[PDB]
């Protein structure tokens, strides 16, 4: 007789994004741990609380091993002969009957283990709300900064984390304002924080262009490569199979509208739009703009270019402290050399 499991199934039921069998597993692990700690002998009793009755029978376990320690769980092949060799070497089934009592020490350790189980079950709730949609621009309010991370939320008691290295260098987020970020690939097994969200990745700019531009949305214009100097300067690479709509004019929009939108959403980062081409030589003479081309030596084995450049455009060709050469090399994959 148990009206209490009936309270589990209707009266003290969970939030409805959590299954009932996990709650039954939580309570069965709770009573198993409670009878485990209470017995003075080192018995790893695992009790099978059957679902429909509520009451149960305490089950001290036994695994088929040939070791010398743990006699309370040490059964052998000749003990598996009692069930005549119909099992496996090492599974922890039982062949015993025990009883159960209650105590306030059992109550408090059961409270500890059930708040651990509902904690990891809520963690699995955030796991399935992550795995329902893989990679998108999201918005949450920052609520508690830290030394190495910025904790976030997505509503419904979810949490996300901006780490230190994947944010803007000009970040200033007082707790209480809404920020934009992209969850990319989080750890569903992480016991602490899981949802790793960035603000200074190429995935950020391409997802921002995806939500911004409808022809990125429906695959008319496509972006192939990207380049980032976070907060200051950027480059992305555009090719297009369609011949109707102007690609660069489309992604700059009406008087630099889309570029200024991503620039103010990114923090003043000068995203410099440039074409993507398939062939290496003509791709890179398209790609180092606004620098000028004298002669190009294309190298295959160590994946580099050699660029002759006339005098006058060296500063805007290299950027500031080698910014443009570095950004163009991690754009194209070919690191650049200086030639006059």
């Amino acid at each position: 007789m148990n009206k209490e499991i009936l309270a589990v199934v209707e009266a003290v039921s969970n939030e409805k994004a959590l299954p009932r069998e996990k709650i039954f597993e939580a309570l069965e692990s709770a009573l198993a741990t409670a009878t485990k700690k209470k017995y003075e002998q080192e018995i790893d009793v695992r009790v099978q609380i059957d679902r429909k009755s509520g009451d149960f029978d305490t089950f001290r376990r036994w695994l088929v091993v040939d070791e010398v320690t743990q006699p309370t769980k040490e059964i052998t092949l000749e003990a598996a002969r009692y069930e005549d060799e119909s099992l496996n070497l090492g599974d922890y089934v039982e062949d015993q009957i025990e009883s159960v009592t209650f105590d306030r020490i059992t109550t408090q350790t059961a409270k500890q283990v059930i708040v651990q189980k509902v904690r990891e079950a809520e963690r699995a709730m955030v796991v399935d709300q992550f795995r329902e949609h893989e990679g998108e621009i999201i918005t949450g309010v920052v609520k508690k900064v830290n030394r190495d991370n910025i904790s976030l939320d997505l509503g419904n008691n979810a949490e996300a984390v901006i780490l230190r290295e994947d944010m803007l260098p000009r970040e200033n987020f007082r707790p209480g304002d809404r920020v934009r970020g992209v969850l990319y690939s989080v750890r569903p097994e992480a016991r602490g924080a899981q949802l790793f969200v960035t603000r200074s990745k190429p995935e950020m700019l391409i997802e921002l262009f995806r939500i911004e531009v409808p022809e990125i949305g429906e695959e008319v214009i496509e972006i192939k490569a990207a380049a980032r100097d976070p907060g200051s300067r950027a480059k992305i690479a555009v090719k297009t199979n369609d011949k109707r709509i102007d690609p660069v004019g489309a992604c700059v929009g009406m008087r630099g509208a889309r570029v200024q939108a991503v620039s103010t959403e990114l923090g003043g980062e000068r995203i410099d739009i440039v074409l993507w081409d398939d062939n290496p030589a003509q791709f890179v003479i398209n790609a180092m703009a606004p620098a000028d081309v004298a002669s190009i030596v294309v190298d295959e084995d160590k994946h580099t270019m050699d660029i002759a450049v006339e005098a006058g455009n060296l500063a805007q060709a290299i950027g500031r402290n080698g910014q443009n050469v570095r950004l163009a090399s991690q754009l194209s994959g070919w690191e650049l050399n200086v030639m006059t």
Partner: protein, 207 residues
């Protein structure tokens, strides 16, 4: 997490009103060993403890401690902001002092600041929608439209601007927003960061 219990413990002895008191055990902690743990956790993470006690108006002397630590942080961090990095010594010390004091008053500002509570919600930021109660029957809540949910009038950053242009007169509002105000927001983010790391070190001590 851990820190606000110590702010409960900084009060005087309050009278109890219940039946049989005095558990007389070490169930949670005493009231003196929490202060001893605050002392043990002061050699590291003293910024956040000073800022927390100055924010919650318990031990109203470490407001100056938090302003001094913020001034030291601004002196260490001022070499990345173009508006402040070109000024001379005592003038840069005085602008760092005035924006440190205003940044700390902006961090301190909650619904208990005199003259800062919302007019309608009285700080709760949660009013009752009468139409949803009339159609649903039950009682509902909504966001207080005047305060927009936060429950208090926020501190405008232009107060520090008005208090610095009595000293730097040739600094207008666009360059204030362009190369001065990020330092101010860096100061308030540093206040929140130091309070979080002090709560973390407190929980590491009293564990």
């Amino acid at each position: 997490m851990r820190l606000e219990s110590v702010a409960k413990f900084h009060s005087p002895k309050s009278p109890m009103m219940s039946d049989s008191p005095r558990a007389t055990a070490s169930d949670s902690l005493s009231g003196t060993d929490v202060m001893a743990a605050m002392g043990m956790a002061q050699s590291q993470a003293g910024f956040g403890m000073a800022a927390f006690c100055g924010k919650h108006e318990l031990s109203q002397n470490d407001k100056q401690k938090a302003i001094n630590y913020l001034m030291q942080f601004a002196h260490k961090v001022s070499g990345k902001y173009r508006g402040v990095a070109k000024l001379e010594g005592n003038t840069k010390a005085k602008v760092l002092q005035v924006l440190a004091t205003f940044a700390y008053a902006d961090y301190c500002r909650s619904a208990a600041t005199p003259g800062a509570r919302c007019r309608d919600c009285h700080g709760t930021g949660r009013a009752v929608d009468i139409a949803k109660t009339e159609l649903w029957g039950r009682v509902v809540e909504k966001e207080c439209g005047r305060c927009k949910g936060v429950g208090y009038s926020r501190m405008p950053a232009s107060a520090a601007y008005r208090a610095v242009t009595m000293l730097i007169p040739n600094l207008t509002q666009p360059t204030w927003s362009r190369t001065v105000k990020p330092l101010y927001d860096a100061l308030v983010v540093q206040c929140h960061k130091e309070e979080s790391i002090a709560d973390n070190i407190l929980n590491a001590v009293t564990r």
